[PDB]
């Protein structure tokens, strides 16, 4: 599996991975915040 | 690639680590105070 | 995403488009940096590491040419980084002053690039920029003025020479240059058509970039029937210098 | 801070006002005196919008709005809290646009190129001035300008449009829409053509302008050329804005505010060739 | 410096150009070719030759079938009078089917002719797309033009085919007429709330405005540096001259960033293609997903409850 | 079967495959969240 | 772990980190300020 | 304070000063006309 | 603190500072003139 | 901690710091002015 | 030399003049603020003036 | 040399002056905040002020 | 050098003579037309109407 | 020639003709204004209509 | 023998002077036309 780095530049791969991860995290957070059961700030209603 | 010597990289890493850790400590104290002001994470029926 | 919930399909689609558009902007700004990088640091800055900006310049790109050769961009050999200029002040962002003659040094608005010293070859390996006397089958559409014979005047009313030929572009039929014989020299120079007003005074050609007595200094061509890209760029820059230094 | 080829161009001279005092760069940006002036105008306008928003009910980006004065003030000066902020923001915006154009003129002079870009920006400045100055004056009051809001000036556009029957029957409006759509078509064509000539099929050399002429002579039977396409692009993009400005000038000042554009076209239906 | 490059001063005339020889697998071109003096004042003077093969001829035949259907219905709606036809030509149309027939094939005088004309026009447009792709491939060039055309085709299909499908009725489509289709546009906006509050409509308008802005900017820039040989955009990329250097430095000193001789055409391509794409998405969402755009805008804080 | 990689360069194919799989997974998750029976956050009664 | 600084320029990394952190903090503050419970300026009224 | 003309060039300072003063006078007059008490053309509003 | 003039040209720094100060003064005067209590021309709204 | 100036140019970091601080102060002052409790010019009802 | 292009002597001279001018500016501003407070005080109470 | 282009002596000098100015700024801001709290307190209870 | 327009002095004077004669005839005919139009219905009413 | 393309004597001739034509334009305009004032005087009495 | 036309070029001063003067005249005439008391075209708006 260590050969993937012979296929992709580690710098570009790492930057793209971090950007993808942050985007996914913030999107999941906002989806949870949009609901009513899992809204942790003002609560359910 | 970056253009940094190995010693420069190690020194930068040490200073970066200590700065990050102090920032984390300050943030944790801020969060303790913020929870003391108003807790989040309500119950399923509200606050 | 259920009916009645706050989340719905339209706003999900909108956020998908926002993410795609951020990606596209990054791709476009990445493509924008294939010429002129890395940057040249100003005065009072460190020169140990390169400045490239946050969208990093992409890897060099290779184009396949007609004969079988290749061309790798960025073209680092076209930059001319060492010219006759001196800084007008020690702080960053200060303009430069020409140390010598800006018409002959190629600085400022009279600056040219170090292009390849060969003519553009066209689709049959024959030069495309050609005098009308060497392009069999082309003429000048008699409905328009015939510049051959008209005198040429500078920005100061002085006559600098006369028009003897019109250099045309084959495969893109257009008049690109006029051949000018200087007043008292029997020598020939080129004048770009976009720099000249044919028939501004009824029987003359007006060039308001350089003074009439400066046509003697226009760079010349090696051969009398073809021009290279470097010579074209130099001839254009010479007239461009007069826009700021003719006084 | 300079591109790899930029140093030989950063020479002194070519200003209009101020001499060599403002003849420097800040990063990539040239400054001049008009750069200072335009940043000043922009910052005053932004601060005024922010102050007008603090006096309002919300900070929502989509609902911010700076409303023009009431019609009871005519063409005079309104109190700052009841319409004057709109007038001062309009003044600041006009100043910023004019100074931007003049800075572009200075850059053109320093580089030694033609003045086509500031001339083309003057058309957009003219359309803005027609919308906020000329038409409100010909109508009688500043209350006819549009609000400075992301979604409130769209409501202004729709109300103004429905104030004349159906705005689609405005003939200058039709010509302007035709020019806009043609501009989009030509931009797509030109971009795609240059890209396909520079990035050819797999295993091919880079093409030439003869291939570019040939492909459109094979498609539609005519090709305009490399200088012709740029001339035509400028022409179309400027004609669209000219005819939109004309479209708005004749609506209200010429055709009354309660009239209908569909009924103008009846001049064609009443020609004596077929009218009775 | 005083000569603006708007009009050609002196025109050069030579023999007609036959064209680059075609890759094997294509018919021969035509030979009729002429020159026009006025077209040469702004651009090129040669007119022709044209290439017609199978796809172009079939495209023209189907398009003329559709045009003939539309015109014969317009003449029948006016009792075949040519005087009354010319009197009101922009007010005539071939109406879409009636709402009571769903997606079936309606009677001829209630939607059948409209459906047949739409079918033949769609086949014509698809054949022209194939022709663009084929003519581009026959010279070894890329296919960017046909993939830009595909976006306009997609907006056309969304307006006429996809949205009626998802709504389950042919009556949701525009008529074939000059003023009637403008009336259809107005009524479509009125029927589904206010189309100003459709965010993809807003994005499409932004991209149309940016297309005009960018094409004005590019035309003005290329005309300004044409004295240094700037209009040869292909040779200026393989061998950078001073014209493109000045062009890039103008916009760098103006607004902080610039492009290359090639990437600006990518900006152009993308801003032109993104208008009909966002438009098609917004049209597909209108009706099937959202039926009142002002209520959507109020729900998401675009406007006060009003 | 390894001959497929004599036609497609592995890097481009792999990038395209990852984009395709991610988009498909996103679409399936959102379709499931759209319904009433398989909504796993708020539950039934849509 | 120190080897990550042989890959990326530390200047651009620090500028990116600072911009990212400031944007995140400003967004979190604005999100809290637009709620009723966690609005510390005018209070829990609205 | 004669030393100011060692740092600046009077021929340009005068132009800048005159333009600034003209703009400031314009601003003040425009602001005065905006009011009811200090409007010297129509006087107080109804 | 005099070392700040080894990094910045005093002429252009001074003119930029004056421009900044003038803009700030104008903004504060507008803000005060736009209120009701601190309007020094017409007075309170009432 | 003085080593931060072996990485960044002090002269431009100082200008960037000035700009950032002024922008932040302006934002905070407008936020305060927009509220009811902390409006120090006209007072509560707003 | 220096990035500015000045020597220590010129820098100290300009700094002295700059401090003097800044201080006169601050003094005039303080007087203006005292006068403005005597005209109308700000910072009301939680219930108003 | 160094990435910035400075030496250690210049770095330390600039850092001394920077730290001094930053600390004066911080002190002034702390006093401003104490006065602002004396004028209005913030952080209300869950039921208002 | 020569003329900025291309016409010599003789051609210029001839064109000017013909131009002046034509302009004068135009003005005379216009004056007669205006006298007749005034005789038909005058303009410039009093401040209260006709 | 020169920047414009004219000599000094040519410029003086141009200026003489320009001045005399502009003067005739101004005098006929003044006559027109006198007539117009006699028809409908602007600047009327305290409240004119 | 006034040196003012020795350090300051007249042909460039005159055009800018005339621009400013013409603009000011236009501004004043507009301001007067847009009022009820000093509108000389018709008069008051009744
Ligand atoms: C709701 C509102 C929405 C709209 C908001 C609009 C906001 C407009 C902001 C305009 C100002 C932006 C300035 C950015 C400068 C960044 C740095 C720089 O020079 O980059 C060069 C760089 C290009 O060169 P590069 O090779 O990529 O990078 C070189 C390096 O930067 C290294 O280059 P260098 O070595 O030359 O050093 C550069 C450095 C020089 O060194 C310095 O330290 C200079 C001293 C100043 C430092 C700090 C400068 C300012 C930092 C950012 C401040 C941002 C806020 C400004 C105020 C905003 C007020 C509202 O900095 C500068 O030159 C700064 C110049 C300006 C001062 O990037 C650009 O030029 C970017 C241009 C962006 C233009 C504005 C685009 C705004 C968005 C448009 C669309 C908006 C849509 C909104 C839709 C809303 C809903 C409908
Ligand atoms: C429930 C279903 C779920 C499905 C799974 C999930 C969704 C999957 C979606 C997949 C979409 C397509 C993916 C593959 C695209 C390949 C494009 C390509 O190779 O372009 C090469 C092209 C470069 O080509 P080149 O180097 O100029 O020329 C190469 C050869 O010399 C010249 O070579 P050539 O002449 O053979 O080609 C010329 C070139 C010309 O360039 C293009 O065509 C590229 C632009 C494509 C536009 C497509 C328009 C489609 C219009 C509607 C569809 C057609 C309707 C009508 C059909 C005909 C009717 C008669 O065209 C192509 O290479 C592509 C042909 C196919 C286009 C349509 C693909 C769909 O790439 C670009 O220019 C850049 C592309 C854009 C990149 C932007 C940055 C990333 C954007 C994404 C950021 C993150 C988004 C996150 C979203 C939210 C997540 C939650
Ligand atoms: C949920 C939220 C999630 C997050 C959201 C946000 C996420 C982040 C987004 C980021 C987007 C990209 C931005 C760039 C990030 C990466 C930068 C990078 O890699 O290097 C910098 C990079 C240049 O790299 P380089 O040329 O290699 O130079 C490397 C060195 O920096 C050259 O070094 P140098 O020495 O030559 O020059 C130095 C100079 C460089 O200056 C600059 O580069 C100026 C520009 C900076 C970047 C500005 C970015 C602005 C981003 C705006 C984002 C959008 C805002 C939208 C707002 C909407 C409002 C409605 O200054 C500094 O770097 C100073 C740093 C050190 C400061 C030290 C302070 C004191 C520390 C010590 C304290 C005391 C300790 C001791 C205590 C005592 C102990 C005893 O910057 C650029 O490329 C600039 C252009 C980038 C695009 C700009 C336009 C983007 C679109 C903007 C739209 C909005 C309008 C404009 C903004 C409006 C704002 C209100
Ligand atoms: C119900 C409403 C009516 C209608 C009512 C109106 C009204 C009212 C108007 C139009 C106008 C237009 N309509 Mg209409 N219109 C309708 C339907 C349409 C349809 C359609 C498909 O149905 C189309 C294509 C159009 C198209 C058009 C254009 C002809 C025109 C908009 C272009 C323009 O004004 O450029 C002008 C461009 C500008 C003014 C841009 C100004 C640029 C400035 C100088 C720069 C600003 C910079 C900024 C401040 C700073 C940014 C810096 C940042 C850092 C980036 N309308 C409907 C039927 N329409 C407008 C028009 O013609 O005005 C001239 C107009 O007022
Ligand atoms: C009152 C009316 C509504 C309104 C109702 C609509 C409706 C409905 C639509 C738009 C659409 C658009 N509107 Mg709108 N729009 C309004 C106000 C505006 C204003 C304005 C200033 O007020 C502007 C600038 C616009 C502009 C726009 C564009 C962004 C967009 C059109 C894209 C396009 O290029 O299609 C033109 C291109 C095509 C239609 C594709 C061309 C198809 C093929 C390529 C052509 C084949 C021709 C064939 C061969 C010829 C022979 C055929 C036979 C002769 C028959 N609208 C108001 C609010 N608008 C469209 C959109 O996509 O938005 C979501 C759309 O459907
Ligand atoms: C990027 C989106 C924009 C766009 C792009 C675009 N349009 C395109 C293309 C592209 C990239 C093409 O390649 C294609 C084309 O051929 O352009 C020259 C085309 C085209 N866009 C056209 C029209 C068009 N585009 C429009 C819009 C837009 N096109 C968008 C704004 C509109 C509008 C606003 O309503 C119209 C009316 C055509 C000129 C052409 C597609 C021609 C076609 O499909 O023909 C079908 C044939 C018939 C209907 C038969 C009847 C004959 C004619 C009535 C049709 C036109 C024929 C003529 C163009 C060529 C004839 C040559 C002869 C020698 C045979
Ligand atoms: C009573 O009513 C009628 C009208 O009066 C109201 C009319 O006025 C007319 C019209 C006639 C006139 C009076 C005008 C004069 C015109 C003519 C004289 C021409 C006569 C025309 C006809 C009689 C019929 C014309 C039909 C044609 C030209 C072909 C039709 C083909 C199809 C409809 C395709 C079938 C549908 C399919 C397959 C759907 C697939 C989807 C697509 C859109 C893609 C289609 C693509 C292809 C099939 C081709 C692909 C080709 C490729 C890839 C290229 C391959 C490589 C090659 C080079 C070959 C008629 C006929 C009519 O009755
Ligand atoms: C059962 C399935 C299988 C079939 C369906 C297959 C689907 C795929 C069909 C889908 C059709 C959709 C997609 C198309 C929808 C169309 C809209 C998008 C756009 C409407 C067009 C708007 C124009 C303004 C029309 C004007 C035309 C008219 C003015 C010209 C008339 C010509 C006359 C004068 C002919 C000259 C006079 C004489 C008598 C000689 O001829
Ligand atoms: C480039 C073009 C390629 C083809 C693109 C389009 C392909 C077709 C898309 C997939 C079809 C989806 O399937 C389609 O679903 C819609 C939406 O419920 C149904 O449409 C439905 O609409 C509503 C309910 O929503 C009812 O009033 C209607 O009677 C019913 O038909 C269609 O009857 C069915 O055909
Ligand atoms: Fe181009």
Residue numbers in the entry:
A (entry chain J): 1 to 45
B (entry chain I): 6 to 52
C (entry chain H): 1 to 247
D (entry chain L): 2 to 277
E (entry chain M): 2 to 307
F (entry chain N), G (entry chain G), H (entry chain A), I (entry chain C), J (entry chain E), O (entry chain 9): 1 to 46
K (entry chain D), L (entry chain F), N (entry chain 8): 4 to 52
M (entry chain 6): 3 to 52
Sentences from the paper on this structure:
LH1 is formed from curved arrays of αβ heterodimers, each of which binds two bacteriochlorophyll (BChl) a molecules and one or two carotenoids.
The 2.80-Å structure of the complex that lacks protein-W shows 16 αβ heterodimers forming a closed LH1 ring completely encircling the RC, hereafter referred to as the RC-LH116 complex. Complexes lacking protein-W were purified from a strain where the pufW gene was deleted (hereafter ΔpufW) allowing only one type of RC-LH1 complex to be produced. In RC-LH116, both the RC QA and QB UQs, which participate in electron transfer during charge separation, were resolved within their binding sites. L-Phe217 rotates to form a π-stacking interaction with the quinone head group, and helix de shifts outward, allowing the backbone of L-Gly222 and side chain of L-Tyr223 to form a hydrogen bond network that stabilizes the holo structure. The gap in the LH114-W ring allows formation of a continuous membrane region between the internal space of the RC-LH114-W complex and the bulk membrane, rather than connection of these two domains by protein pores as in the RC-LH116 complex, similar to those of the closed Tch. tepidum complex. Although the presence of sequestered quinone precludes the accurate determination of an apparent Michaelis constant (fit at 0.2 ± 0.1 μM and 0.5 ± 0.2 μM for RC-LH114-W and RC-LH116, respectively), the maximum rate of RC-LH114-W (4.6 ± 0.2 e− RC−1 s−1) was 28 ± 5% greater than that of RC-LH116 (3.6 ± 0.1 e− RC−1 s−1). The 880-nm absorption of RC-LH116 was redshifted by 3 nm relative to the 877 nm band of RC-LH114-W.
